[PDB]
């Protein structure tokens, strides 16, 4: 049987599926460790690998990418799970190796490929503690070109009054996403700071895993694809809206939670964002 993971209903994606809005024709690049394209509960439309020794983006030797991609777009059928945007066209943009790490130039090259191939949404479930001129340039150009760009805030918890949001989430051009649980409580690991934009479910999230498996994971990596998927739903109902409009509709319709330093504007609500 097919199960709907709790995070997909918490953001209210089912209300949009009920009017026929499921992401059809919206192109989502998952910039990550690749995606297992032979998964029975996934359809991958294209891709490229930037990782010099792992040239197949359709083989995911880590498991991370495939799990992120199932949150965005696991197929609506009679098996496994269901994505936020289950008719989305998923692109595998492999920038991380089997150990889940990559060089900054591989990440940049991934973003560049996403611009060149006209992606509508980019999801980045990844980060580092330092930025760079080339990385800042590349995300600001994706946004200038029209792309909605979403990234994990980071898993560094609190450190007083200091911000713990990593890059590229820390850039103003990027929607930085933190993690809540099924009770709308911030997860202990979730990064904080003025750069934090919104929250989405990040605790015990079931999704697809390589080799026809399913599995629950935690992290701001799992919260980010909820928002990338939400963007794709909004664009399938309003294909005429810009990235500016999509971002502002999500930020203005959240369920408000705590202090913005810990919760950004609050938990996304895609049903409300899509009625704006």
């Amino acid at each position: 049987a097919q199960s709907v993971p709790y995070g997909v209903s918490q953001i209210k994606a089912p209300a949009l599926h009920s009017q026929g809005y499921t992401g059809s024709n919206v192109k989502v690049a998952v910039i990550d460790s690749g995606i297992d394209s032979s998964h029975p509960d996934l359809k991958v439309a294209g891709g490229a690998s930037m990782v010099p020794s792992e040239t197949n983006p359709f083989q995911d030797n880590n498991s991370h990418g495939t799990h992120v991609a199932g949150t965005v777009a696991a197929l609506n059928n009679s098996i496994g799970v269901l994505g936020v945007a289950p008719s989305a066209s998923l692109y595998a943009v492999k920038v991380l190796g089997a150990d889940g790490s990559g060089q900054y130039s591989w990440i940049i090259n991934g973003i560049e490929w996403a611009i060149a191939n006209n992606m509508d949404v980019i999801n980045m479930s990844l980060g580092g503690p330092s930025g760079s001129a080339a990385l800042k340039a590349a995300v600001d150009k994706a946004v200038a070109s029209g792309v909605v760009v979403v990234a994990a805030a980071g898993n560094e918890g609190t450190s007083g009054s200091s911000s713990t949001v990593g890059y590229p989430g820390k850039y103003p051009s990027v929607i930085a996403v933190g993690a809540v649980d099924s009770s709308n409580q911030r997860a202990s690991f979730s990064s904080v700071g003025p750069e934090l934009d919104v929250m989405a479910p990040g605790v015990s999230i079931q999704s697809t895993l390589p080799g026809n498996k399913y599995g629950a994971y935690n992290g701001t990596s799992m919260a980010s694809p909820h928002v990338a998927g939400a963007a794709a739903l909004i664009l399938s109902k309003h294909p005429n809206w810009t990235n500016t409009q999509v971002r502002s509709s999500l930020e203005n319709t959240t369920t408000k939670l705590g202090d913005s330093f810990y919760y950004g504007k609050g938990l996304i609500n895609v049903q409300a964002a899509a009625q704006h």
Partner: protein
Amino acid sequence: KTEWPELVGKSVEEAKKVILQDKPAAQIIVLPVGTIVTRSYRIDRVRLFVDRLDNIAQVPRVG
């Protein structure tokens, strides 16, 4: 206990001992400083970011 500020520019082995001699089942991974990594949070994992001198450059942290 979730981070080891105290592990500074200590060597590989000093970090491995302290961390294991504090968190027995640690899955420890050594990676270069200046790389990007996934943002999954795994309670078992402690990633160690080193300079070219095999010394800890950044606060090691569970997850």
